[PDB]
Amino acid sequence: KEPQLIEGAKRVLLLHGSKCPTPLHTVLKVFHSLTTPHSVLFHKKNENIHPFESTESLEFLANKNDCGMVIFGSSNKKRPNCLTIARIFDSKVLDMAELLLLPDANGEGIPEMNRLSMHVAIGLRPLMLFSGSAWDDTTSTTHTMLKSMLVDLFKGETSDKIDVEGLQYALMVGAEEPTAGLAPIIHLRWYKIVTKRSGHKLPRVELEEIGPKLDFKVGRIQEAPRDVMKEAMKQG
Amino acid sequence: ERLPITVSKPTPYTFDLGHLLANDPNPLELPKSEPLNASLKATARDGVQSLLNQLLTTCPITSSQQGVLLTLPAPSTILPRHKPLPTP
């Protein structure tokens, strides 16, 4: 509630706009489950909230719930199935990004879920994999911001120790190789990790597909003022 | 001795084990002849193989009553704070 030298898990606020569709709600529920116990799910059908018009109400709810991150679901004709990620620094919005949920592989949809999988404990730290060349491009501010935000979102509570039994699942965020004239696409996939003996001292890794299969198109970006950003990046 | 635990690619993987994180900077291969989820799963399997290899190989392991624990290096990816550095 008061500033700490070493902050714990960055608390996450999940809430939605007017007439938010079922897949988005599933996404909000799963994200809520993955960020347990440091997340807050607001079931209000919030209206008049438009982050890129004004982040004020956003900041209000976030600060009132002491959350450093906000995941806001909304949908309209111009921007359907929109997931807005916003970070809060010093009671105000730091940076913000839109991710627009793309349709399914074709004709299965996104199944209704409230958690990632029964084979994965709630609140376990994920292994993270960012694949694609875009994450390595220091001049793509979009992918830099998205990587920073996603790691910030799913890192849970970091520690210098982890049980080998805790290495159960992984999140891959793959950036499609970009083309001129097209908004960047990213893919989020979760996998249960299964290790088989391989003869070597290191086990062979196999994966089992789990949770929702998410495809996003990047929308609007609101960068942070370099003043505010460099103030926020200072580590004690 | 018969199934490979090593992945090799033109560009090497990078790591942030403090965040249990690996980067595969190689181009994301999504062949049209194959279903998207299968390609993604293959890439992911390679990457998690690499990440796990790195974790088991380079981290100190401590076995006790508290269990079998990897010691993780401090997170190398710097992330923005929520609240400003406290009043000294």
Residue numbers in the entry:
A (entry chain A): 19 to 254
B (entry chain B): 17 to 104
Direct quotes from the study:
In 2007, an Rpf2-subcomplex comprising two assembly factors (Rpf2 and Rrs1), two ribosomal proteins (RpL5 and RpL11) and 5S rRNA was isolated from Saccharomyces cerevisiae (Sc). Moreover, depletion blocked the conversion of 27SB pre-rRNA to 7S and 25.5S pre-rRNA. These results suggested that Rpf2 and Rrs1 load 5S rRNA, RpL5 and RpL11 into the 90S precursor. These results show that the N-terminal domain of Rpf2 plays a critical role in binding to both 5S rRNA and Rrs1.
A proteolysis-resistant complex of AnRpf2 and AnRrs1 (Rpf2-Rrs1 core complex), comprising residues 18–262 of AnRpf2 and residues 10–113 of AnRrs1, was crystallized into an orthorhombic P212121 space group with the unit-cell parameters a = 54.1, b = 123.3, c = 133.8 Å (22). The crystal contained two independent Rpf2-Rrs1 core complexes (complex-1: chain A(Rpf2)-B(Rrs1) and complex-2: chain C(Rpf2)-D(Rrs1)). The structure comprised a wide, twisted half β-barrel in which 10 β-strands were surrounded by four α-helices and two 310 turn helices. Rrs1 was composed of a single long α-helix (residues 52–74), four short β-strands and a long C-terminal loop (residues 88–104). Three regions contributed to the molecular interactions between Rpf2 and Rrs1. The amphiphilic long α-helix of Rrs1 formed both hydrophobic and hydrophilic interactions with the wide β-sheet of Rpf2. The long C-terminal loop of Rrs1 wrapped around the side of Rpf2.
